[PDB]
Design a protein around this ligand. Structure first.
Ligand SMILES: [Mg+2]
Ligand SMILES: [Mg+2]
Ligand SMILES: [Zn+2]
Ligand SMILES: [Zn+2]
Ligand SMILES: [Zn+2]
Ligand SMILES: [Zn+2]
Ligand SMILES: [Zn+2]
Lengths: 49, 538, 275, 117, 50, 49, 67, 46, 576
């Protein structure tokens, strides 16, 4: 074990990426919330280009 | 055109955009490649040979709107509007209040503003569908009449219908989520969530824990205000140094119970308890509050014409049409031409006819639709003045107004500018004895700033005594005793008997001076540097 | 006074939802003011007290409560009979100044259940309740006369609440306004030239213009005076429009009589004498 | 709210009075009356009602502020004719006309229990 | 002037000295009170090689 | 940062179709702050070998 | 969202004519005929309904709206 | 007060006056919910 | 660091003395109120509930003062605290018998802030002496400050969301000090440029133009209605302007009623009308195009701003001189009230109709552009032939770029002049432009006809796209569009390319504005720190803080700049 890597939302590893909207609402997730930004200590974080 | 049919086939079966990429009828292009390519503006006109100054075109734009960003894409016909207004809209669009997702209930952000009755734009750009804007609108298309009225709409404001406010005009919920954690405060010292009584604890200053539950937390649905204790917890400190009887029920139970800042009022929305990576037990509570439009609150048009509510009137007081239609908003005419925002009129003109048509118009800046006359000709067809101008009856005398009025629907923004959060005042309260300056600000009930330039004006004013009241009396007042033998401030001063100036053996020749306390501190600071400044009237 | 208008009256058309009529021989100030009376002045009953006992639905109580306001209660039971709760010197409220309402719903069914005004009942003595298949044992319903869908409930959602309807009028809040937009017209030919109408062809003709139908682009008279006001009252459903007008007419008279009594009181309270 | 309740627009406080009566201190047979919790809506017909009277030398009114609920009326009539009578005459005439308007309305509505055709 | 702690007045020995954080004032109710001094409020200051 | 003064912000013409010209804050960061075009895309890097 | 009764511009009720409209749409793909059938002869009322949108069903789409 | 914890995920009241470490029966999750207030609450229809 | 603590870097100097916080102050967003007198300021009740004044008890008002104590904190017309002669203060909220509580003359009572009180109001940022003025309070609903429009003028405030700051003095010296100096009425004329600072604007200015129209006629009923709006009036109804066929009053008659009755302002109609310098002399039907008022009675002349204020020869400046600030402020408040009420009933709007011009002229304008387009091509081909003659002292390119620029300017001006002709006087836009409000002919060109050439630092758009601006253009292109010329109108819309060039220039204005905004604060600071060392002395000589003489007398006369005025000496008359 080398570490715990923070992952971008809607990543390939964000397993929710395959789930339907219906699945996402089943998860209480927003289907129009694609993410693409990390969640750090429960806070949403976006990289600026 | 058959490839389009393939794109149509994709809705059911398959025909990927990548296949379209694989089709090689379109390619993806960088700026270096752009330097060499002969780009075309449009498929139609450029293929013409009759006036072919060039025909060496190599590639063509999908659509000129593709230059546009998320914000610019929202406002129709930006080219009929002054260019910066769009940048102002692009910023102000970001400033607007609105919905943002679907599951607001699971969400418990520190701050949120959501509209009761949002509306998709009566005039829309097709791309906004891809922006899912019609799914998540952030304003409504209100029907507005352009008129100066009483001048209360002058300079970046508007008069609005109070009676419309009664129907639920732009009313919104405000949600604030509070979070609070329990944790150690030393080897033994720690916070302890509870509902302490006034005699079983200290540090309670004066506030009561009635709202609390035995757990120390307020119940969900409870009415709240900006003073009471929102979360109850207390921390005993020495456990042994208190010893022997100065017991009391308060013991060493020092208060650390969380209370609400002296401003907010409302009802408890939600309460959630859990634990984190730190492991410490913590709770999160959401508080619901309601935002209603009020005089002075900031609002905005979709065309970057922001304005505050200058005032609100009942529907009866408002001037009205042949039907008696009172507009939702009364905007000052003059604000448009100076800014040259013709597009603002086009939303209204397109919106008017679309409403009459009962059908949505596209808001793409580039068309062959001939929006000027054809719409105007069409506006005449629904049985209206072809230019949109219409006579209205007086709200008070009922008489027909001398001028004719351009009236119609328009997408409007409620901006993130709670004026009641912007106000701030104080006459007396907590200070900062370290400098004797007022508290930092409103969230600590502080005084208001005084700047170098107000001083500069005040000198230019010549009213030294008001500055003196302001610099001394309204901020930093002090009394000092000095030895007559030396301008050095040295006294022991039995503040009920003797004064004396040690080192000078002064016994009676004491004198009193008025200076700022912060200034005396600076002077003491000079003495710490071994400087002995002194001062006399002689 | 030696002379006054005869306030000519003519009624053109009436329904339970609207009334169209023409008033003549009267001042324009009277026409607008009475028009202002039609909206604000008419007293009505509306909910002022709501307790929500339970709500497992998605919406928050205050949303529904605002909606409870938005409910168009019919006023066809002389709602004026109830004393004002303020003046009724009763502990906050009473049946002499309040009606009571209660709503309890639970979605045990798996499919989405819809909630309606019918789920809300007048616990107080059956003064005519919300307009939802109560007036209409009439084979003339709109489609169902389910007038308002309160909310929808997926399986598992519940709603328990109580309400108090109280006396009020449009000026207090629009929810107490028993009227929608009020139609009004005088002098379509613009003989008074209250506005220019440049190129009258750019101005389509009004239905009243038709009577003075004309192809002379707008006849003119400098000596003219506002006359033949055309009315069409649009009731919101809360009451029959003509009946709204009478209550409006009665109220304005009463409003004036009290001022005269006060005017007598001004001269009584004063040292002035008149006779 | 940092603003008064809606009933305060028309409802008077126990220390308030609906109207206040003052004599003019500038010209003879004139007075200025102040009406509280009221608007131009009342004001305009009464001005007109007084204007209809030829015995009136002067009549006029205004709110002190639109946000405020109060009006003031200045009136001057012939030296033999008091401004109080003009206001009294104007209101009694106006109320009377309203009653007939109502009665003709009643006659007009009543005049079609079925249909006019 | 050592009798500070939390209770004294010139007319009576104070029995109670409430701290009004809101206005940042010290009040002694049973006579009228302004024992003076709000030190900057602890209820304002309750959010705070070898 | 590196390379300052006599350089400023205005606009470059190649930005056409690359960035929305209107999409910028009205603060001092104006023009200093840019925003992605509607259909612009970014190279991820590959091996030409 | 959740069709507010009474058109803000006038006051025309529509507390059940949304679904009826939606019914009208399923029955007739003519908004004009739908809009007309509803009785919204005024376009202010038409704008009310035409520009209305109801996401609640998506909110309903969730399962967990149980607690 | 019988109130005091309606777990989030099992969606069930724990319901006691306890200083337990925010635990929950069957459902090991710590996410807790607190019952609606047992108080008189007036609402206006404005 | 002990030196640092002092040093100024948030030290005792800059971080404390140069800027700190104060009490008895409030700041909110601003809202408009033309109904307010120029001294009034609208004030939130909560602020008024927050604000208080500690009055010293006098036997003349002690009973009332006691009522405020008795009324206490529980209502606005009450008092929060009382401060006794010996220094003792009492909280009336916790006092056991607030009403029964004893009090005497010489005690101080902290009562709530009341209306009619004088406060000092400020802009932030503060730029001049009118930026801080004494004001009269007005207690109102909602947490908004309401102000007279014309008070916005020296403030330059915007209701887009500006906050400004107010301070309430607690001393009678200062109350006098604010009243005798800080009060706005004295602030009317600026000594910086011996001109007035007040200015009636926008709606008010437009309706005034509208009001001066010859076609303005009034009814007796409305005259009474107008008369009541008057803040002051003689009580004596004026004679009708017309008797037959029916009695009537003119707006000029009624405007002249507003005017004080023994002062006149002449010579500056300052409107485009009539003609420049000799046409109106063309017989002297002196006409409605020139302004003239006698004995407080307007003879003729559509009004302008140069008449209305903030300029030389203005009515406002002379009224200030004769009638004084106090009479002029009441006249000004009164006129705004009247014009507002007339405007309210008269009404004013704007629409696409206002953008409508004549098709044929509009057809001629495009064809004028077509000839100019053709004119550019003639210039391009000659240069390509190298047969084009370079301007002396300039390169051929400098000539070429200059030559194309004259054409793009002449054509746009010509086509603009067609649009100035093409618009009726009936138009709101022409009405708005003429009145002296926020508009002009160039606007008409931009909205109706043509925006014109876009440029970079005054130069045509550079070839950033490799000897090109865009790949839509051919290489070596020199078309005006290829260099930023916006030929279309705001009504016509913009091409994708023109919009971009239009967007670019908008940046230039905006960037310059942001940079200019920061720098002025800094430059001023450099300026103030220098000039603070000097003041006028009683011997008329100008001196510094060390009493050394700067001037024999201030401005070499010792007189006030405000009392100075623009005059012609005319002794430099040509022929001896
Ligand atoms: Mg500004
Ligand atoms: Mg402004
Ligand atoms: Zn000494
Ligand atoms: Zn009762
Ligand atoms: Zn005491
Ligand atoms: Zn409607
Ligand atoms: Zn569980």
């Amino acid at each position: 074990f080398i570490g715990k890597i923070p992952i971008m939302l809607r990543s390939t590893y964000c397993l929710l990426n395959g789930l339907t909207d219906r699945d996402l609402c089943e998860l209480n997730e927003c289907p129009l919330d694609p993410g693409g930004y990390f969640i750090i200590n429960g806070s949403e974080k976006v990289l600026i280009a | 055109k058959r490839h389009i049919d393939q794109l149509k086939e994709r809705e059911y079966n398959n025909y990927s955009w990548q296949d379209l990429v694989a089709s090689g009828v379109v390619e993806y292009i960088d700026t270096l490649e752009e330097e060499t390519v002969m780009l075309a503006m449009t498929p139609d006109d450029l293929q013409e040979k009759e006036v072919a100054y060039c025909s060496t075109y190599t590639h063509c734009e999908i659509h000129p709107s593709m230059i546009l960003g998320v914000c610019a894409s929202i406002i129709p016909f930006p080219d009929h509007n002054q260019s910066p207004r769009n940048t102002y809209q692009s910023a102000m669009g970001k400033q607007a209040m609105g919905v943002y997702i679907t599951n607001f209930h699971v969400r418990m952000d520190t701050l949120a503003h959501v509209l009761y009755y949002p509306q998709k734009p009566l005039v829309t750009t097709r791309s906004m569908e891809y922006l899912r804007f019609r799914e998540l609108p952030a304003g409504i298309n209100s029907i507005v009449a352009i008129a100066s009225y009483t001048g209360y709409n002058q300079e970046d404001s508007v008069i609005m219908n109070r009676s419309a406010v009664d129907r639920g005009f732009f009313r919104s919920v405000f949600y604030r989520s509070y979070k609070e954690q329990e944790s150690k405060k030393g080897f033994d010292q720690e916070e302890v969530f509870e509902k302490p009584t006034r005699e079983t604890c200290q540090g309670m200053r004066h506030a009561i824990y009635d709202k609390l539950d035995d757990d120390g937390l307020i119940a969900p649905g409870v009415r709240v205000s900006g003073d009471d204790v929102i979360i109850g917890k207390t921390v005993t400190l020495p456990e042994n140094e208190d010893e022997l009887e100065s017991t009391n029920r308060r013991y060493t139970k020092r208060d650390c119970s969380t209370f609400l800042r002296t401003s907010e009022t409302g009802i408890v929305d939600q309460v959630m308890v859990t634990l984190n990576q730190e492991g410490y037990k913590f709770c999160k509570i959401r508080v619901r509050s309601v935002r209603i439009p009020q005089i002075g609150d900031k609002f905005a048009s979709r065309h970057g014409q922001k304005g505050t509510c200058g005032i609100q009137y009942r529907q009866e007081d408002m001037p009205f049409t042949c039907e008696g239609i009172t507009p939702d908003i009364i905007i000052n005419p003059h604000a448009i031409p100076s800014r040259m925002t013709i597009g603002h009129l086009i939303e209204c003109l397109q919106g008017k006819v679309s409403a009459n048509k009962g059908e949505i118009g596209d808001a793409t800046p580039f068309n062959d639709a001939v929006n000027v006359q054809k719409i105007s000709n069409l506006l005449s067809d629904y049985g209206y003045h072809l230019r949109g101008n219409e006579v209205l009856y007086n709200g008070f005398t009922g008489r027909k107004i001398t001028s004719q009025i351009f009236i119609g629907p328009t997408y409007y923004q409620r901006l993130k500018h709670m004026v009641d959060d912007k106000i701030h005042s104080r006459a007396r309260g907590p200070i900062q004895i370290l400098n004797r300056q007022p508290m930092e600000g409103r969230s600590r009930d502080g005084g208001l700033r005084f700047g170098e330039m107000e001083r500069d004006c005040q000198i230019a004013h010549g009213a030294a005594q008001f500055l003196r009241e302001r610099l001394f009396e309204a901020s930093d007042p002090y009394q000092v005793h000095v030895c007559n033998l030396c301008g050095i401030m040295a006294i022991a001063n039995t503040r009920t008997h003797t004064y004396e100036c040690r080192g000078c053996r002064n016994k009676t020749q004491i004198s009193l001076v008025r200076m700022p306390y912060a200034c005396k501190l600076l002077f003491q600071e000079l003495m710490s540097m071994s400087i002995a400044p002194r001062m006399m009237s002689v | 006074m030696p002379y006054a208008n005869q306030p000519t009256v003519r009624i053109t058309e009436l329904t339970d939802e609207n009334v169209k009529f023409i008033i003549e021989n009267t001042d324009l100030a009277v026409a607008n003011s009475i028009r202002r009376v039609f909206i604000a002045e008419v007293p009505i009953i509306a909910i002022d007290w709501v307790q929500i006992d339970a709500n497992s639905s998605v919406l928050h109580d205050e949303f529904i409560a605002h909606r409870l306001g938005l409910i168009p209660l019919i006023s066809d039971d002389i709602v004026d009979k109830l004393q004002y709760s303020r003046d009724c010197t009763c502990e906050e409220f009473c049946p002499e100044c309040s009606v009571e309402f209660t709503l309890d719903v639970r979605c045990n069914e798996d499919q989405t259940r819809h909630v309606t005004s019918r789920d809300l009942i007048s616990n107080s003595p059956r003064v005519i309740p919300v307009t939802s298949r109560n007036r209409d044992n009439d084979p003339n319903d709109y489609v169902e006369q389910d007038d308002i869908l309160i909310v929808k409930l997926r399986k598992g959602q519940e709603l328990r609440l109580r309400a108090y309807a109280k006396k009020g009028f449009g000026k207090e809040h629009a929810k107490w306004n028993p009227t929608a937009g009020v139609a009004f017209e005088y002098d379509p030919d613009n003989a008074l030239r209250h506005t220019v109408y440049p190129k009258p062809e750019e101005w389509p003709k009004s239905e009243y213009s038709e009577l003075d139908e004309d192809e002379s682009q707008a006849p003119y008279d400098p000596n003219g005076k506002p006359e033949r006001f055309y009315y069409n009252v649009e009731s919101c459903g809360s009451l029959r429009p003509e009946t709204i007008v009478l209550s409006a007419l009665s109220g304005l008279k009463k409003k004036l009589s009290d001022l005269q009594t006060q005017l007598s009181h001004e001269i009584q309270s004063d040292v002035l004498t008149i006779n | 709210m940092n603003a008064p309740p809606a009933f305060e627009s028309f409802l008077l406080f126990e220390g308030e009075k609906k109207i206040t009566i003052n004599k003019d201190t500038k010209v003879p047979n004139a007075c200025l009356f102040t009406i509280n919790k009221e608007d131009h809506t009342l004001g305009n017909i009464i001005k007109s009602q007084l204007l209809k009277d030829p015995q009136v030398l002067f009549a006029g009114y205004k709110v002190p502020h639109p946000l405020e609920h109060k009006i003031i009326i200045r009136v001057q009539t012939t030296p033999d004719y008091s401004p109080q009578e003009a206001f009294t005459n104007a209101i009694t005439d106006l109320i009377s006309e309203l009653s007939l308007l109502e009665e003709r309305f009643r006659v007009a509505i009543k005049d079609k229990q079925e249909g006019i055709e | 002037l050592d009798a500070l702690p939390r209770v004294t007045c010139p007319n009576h020995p104070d029995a109670i000295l409430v701290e009004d954080y809101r206005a940042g004032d010290m009040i002694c109710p049973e006579c009228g009170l302004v024992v003076g001094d709000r030190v900057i409020d602890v209820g304002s200051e309750w959010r705070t090689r070898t | 940062r590196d390379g300052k003064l006599a350089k400023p912000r205005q606009l470059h013409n190649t930005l056409w179709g690359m960035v929305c010209p209107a999409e910028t804050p009205e603060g001092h960061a104006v023009g200093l702050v840019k925003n992605l075009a509607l259909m612009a895309y970014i190279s991820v890097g590959s091996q030409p070998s | 969202m959740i069709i507010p009764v009474r058109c803000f511009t006038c006051g025309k009720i529509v507390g059940n004519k949304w679904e009826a409209y939606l019914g009208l749409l399923q029955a007739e793909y003519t908004e004009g005929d739908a809009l007309d059938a509803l009785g919204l002869k005024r376009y202010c009322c038409r704008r009310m309904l035409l520009a209305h949108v109801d996401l609640i069903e998506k909110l309903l789409n969730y399962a967990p709206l149980e607690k | 007060q019988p109130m005091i914890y309606i777990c989030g995920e099992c969606h069930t009241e724990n319901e006691i006056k306890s200083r337990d470490p925010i635990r929950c029966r069957e459902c090991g999750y710590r996410i807790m919910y607190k019952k609606r207030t047992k108080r008189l609450v007036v609402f206006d229809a404005r | 660091s002990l030196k640092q603590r002092l040093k100024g870097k948030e030290g005792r100097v800059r971080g404390n003395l140069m800027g700190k916080r104060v009490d008895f102050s409030a700041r909110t967003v601003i809202t408009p109120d033309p109904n307010l007198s120029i001294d009034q300021v609208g004030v939130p009740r909560s602020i008024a509930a927050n604000m208080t004044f500690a009055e010293i008890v006098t036997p003349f008002n002690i009973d009332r003062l006691q009522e405020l104590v008795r009324r206490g904190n529980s209502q606005y017309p009450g008092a929060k605290y009382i401060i006794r002669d010996n220094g003792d203060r009492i909280d009336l909220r916790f006092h056991p018998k607030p009403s029964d509580l004893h009090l005497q003359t010489g005690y101080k009572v902290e009562r709530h802030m009341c209306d009619g009180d004088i406060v000092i109001f400020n802009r932030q940022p503060t730029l001049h002496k009118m930026s801080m003025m004494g004001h009269r309070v007005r207690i109102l609903p909602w947490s908004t400050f309401r102000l007279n429009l014309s008070v916005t003028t020296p403030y330059n405030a915007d209701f887009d969301g500006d906050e400004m700051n107010l301070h309430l003095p607690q001393s009678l010296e200062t109350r006098a000090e604010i009243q005798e100096l800080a009060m706005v009425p004295r602030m009317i004329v600026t000594p910086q440029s011996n001109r007035p600072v007040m200015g009636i604007v926008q709606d008010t200015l437009t309706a005034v133009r509208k009001f001066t129209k010859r076609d303005v006629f009034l009814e007796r009923g409305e005259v009474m209605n107008l008369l009541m709006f008057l803040s002051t009036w003689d009580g004596k109804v004026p004679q009708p302007a017309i008797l037959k066929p029916r009695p009537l009053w003119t707006g000029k008659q009624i405007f002249s009623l507003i005017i004080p009755g023994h002062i006149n302002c002449i010579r500056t109609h300052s409107t485009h009308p009539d003609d420049e310098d000799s046409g109106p002399y063309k017989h002297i039907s002196p006409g409605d195009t020139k302004v003239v008022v006698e004995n407080g009675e307007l003879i003729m002349g559509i009004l302008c701003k140069k008449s209305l204020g903030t300029s030389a020869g203005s009515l406002v400046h002379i009224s200030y001189l004769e009638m004084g600030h106090d009479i002029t402020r009441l006249f000004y408040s009164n006129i705004q009230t009247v014009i507002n009420n007339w405007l309210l009933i008269e009404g004013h709007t704007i629409g696409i109709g206002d953008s409508i011009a004549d098709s044929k002229t509009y057809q001629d304008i495009q064809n004028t552009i077509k000839k100019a387009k053709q004119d550019v091509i003639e210039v391009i081909e000659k240069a390509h032939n190298n047969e084009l003659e370079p301007t002396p002292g300039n390169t051929l390119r400098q000539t070429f770029e200059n030559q194309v620029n004259r054409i793009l300017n002449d054509a746009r001006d010509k086509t603009g002049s067609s649009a100035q002709k093409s618009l009726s006087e009936y138009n709101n836009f022409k009405s708005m432009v003429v009145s002296g409000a926020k508009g002009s002919k160039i606007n008409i060109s931009q909205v109706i006809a043509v925006v014109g050439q876009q440029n970079v630092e005054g130069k045509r758009i550079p070839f950033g796209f490799k000897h090109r601006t865009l790949p839509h253009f051919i290489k070596d292109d020199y078309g005006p569009e290829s260099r930023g010329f916006v030929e279309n109108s705001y009504l016509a819309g913009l091409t994708p390319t023109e919009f971009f060039f239009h967007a670019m220039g908008g940046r230039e204005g905006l960037i310059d504005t942001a940079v200019k905004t920061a720098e002025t604060g800094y430059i001023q600071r450099r300026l103030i720190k220098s000039m603070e060392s000097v003041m006028v002395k009683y011997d008329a000589t100008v001196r510094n803080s060390i009493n050394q003489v700067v001037q024999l007398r201030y401005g070499e006369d010792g007189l006030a700049g405000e009392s100075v005025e623009f005059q012609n000496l005319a002794t430099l008359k040509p022929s001896n």
